[PDB]
Design a protein around this ligand. Structure first.
Ligand code: HEM
Length: 357
């Protein structure tokens, strides 16, 4: 379903806009007759689907990893998520905040030292996101360089080690509070999701979000003058970018009414976060002074991003510190020359971001 990933730079491509004109829920019978698919394109309908108990995340023919919450349905999903959820409480993010600020400052220190220009994605955003993830996980300091490199069995041995001798961070918390109830492979899988796909989403928000701010220089400056706008800005940035563009299909376990339409048992629904966040032209222009941003960039319901508290805090700290420390930041090429990754279900990202100051 490539149309769900068609963009014009950061905006929707005309072909996807035309699809969205077909209403918030679009029936897609497959030409070969093999299945009936549905596209959920509107904010309300996406929330209807994602909050419903009448869908599962089955594999459909139209890698399974231990500890990967996104591939579990209740009740195992509920069991595992309950064990790990406390690593993201407000108490946990509050304690982590100054250490994340310091890691952000470390990386802007490196940026300030190497001097301009920099390829911001590879040299700043990536390392920053990976280092914050290590700190959140409580990876032993001696292992962080190697873990980040390998990320680009080891994970299990790392989990086995840091477990039998608990430490700090999410991994230490889970092992200490639920040691017997979680295997080394499951703990490794929890780590892998944080270090791999989560860093991908976060790094892409950091780099493409920086571009977006630079493309709206009045708002770049506004965030420097009014850093209390940071939480609002992050909501508007994750909405506008929609770096996680489309979700894994939800298969109806019984006939179910969605958006006034009957989705039949066994039919698969594809939720477009991109369309839901961007296809309403009323409130689409980028504006960090919006006090409340309407979006589903982190999903909704039982699979709502477990990392959203960390992501929101890390992005707020990063964007606010960046605009403060580099008031003269600009793209080192015209924005129209920036390359974006071609249509894919992979994370939406730019390919490089040359910046100067
Ligand atoms: C801007 C960054 C991020 C975005 C846009 C994002 C987006 C999402 C979305 C849309 C989902 C739900 C997928 C679905 O329902 O099919 C999700 C799930 C998840 N996210 Fe994130 N994510 C981000 C960062 C993070 C981070 C930093 C972490 C961990 C530290 C994380 C961990 C997870 C996990 C573990 C799940 C699965 C939860 C479950 O299935 O119960 N994510 N994410």
């Amino acid at each position: 379903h490539r149309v769900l990933h068609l963009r014009d730079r950061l905006d929707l491509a005309a072909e996807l806009k035309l699809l969205c004109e077909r209403g918030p829920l679009v029936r897609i019978p497959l030409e070969d007759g093999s299945a009936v698919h549905w596209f959920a394109l509107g904010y309300d309908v996406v929330r209807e689907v994602l909050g419903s108990e009448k869908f599962d995340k089955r594999v459909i023919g139209t890698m399974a990893l231990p500890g990967n919450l996104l591939q579990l349905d209740p009740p195992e999903h509920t069991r595992l998520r309950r064990m790990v959820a406390p690593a993201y409480s407000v108490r946990r993010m509050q304690a982590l905040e100054p250490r994340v600020q310091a890691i952000v400052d470390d990386h802007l220190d490196t940026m300030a030292s190497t001097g301009p220009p920099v390829e911001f994605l590879r040299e700043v955003a990536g390392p920053m996101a990976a280092r914050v993830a290590c700190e959140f996980l409580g990876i032993p300091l001696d292992d962080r360089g190697e873990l980040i490199r390998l990320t680009a069995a080891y994970m299990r041995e790392l989990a086995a080690r840091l477990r039998r001798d608990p430490g700090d961070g999410m991994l230490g918390m889970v092992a200490r509070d639920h040691g017997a109830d979680i295997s080394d492979e499951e703990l490794a899988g929890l780590c892998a999701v944080v270090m791999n796909s989560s860093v991908e989403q976060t790094e892409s928000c950091l780099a493409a979000g920086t571009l977006l701010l630079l493309e709206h220089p009045e708002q770049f400056a506004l965030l420097r003058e009014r850093p209390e706008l940071g939480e609002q800005a992050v909501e508007e940035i994750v909405r506008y970018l929609s770096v996680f563009e489309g979700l894994d299909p939800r298969t109806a376990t019984e006939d179910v009414e969605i958006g006034g339409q009957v989705i039949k048992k066994g039919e698969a629904v594809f939720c477009s976060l991109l369309a839901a966040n961007r296809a309403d032209p009323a409130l689409d222009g980028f504006d960090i002074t919006r006090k409340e941003s309407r979006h589903v960039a982190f999903g909704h319901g039982i699979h709502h991003c477990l990392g959203a508290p960390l992501a929101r805090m890390e992005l707020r700290i990063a964007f606010t510190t960046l605009v403060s420390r580099f008031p003269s930041l600009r793209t080192a090429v015209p924005a129209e020359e920036i390359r974006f990754r071609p249509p894919s279900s992979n994370v939406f990202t730019l390919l490089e971001l040359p910046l100067t100051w």
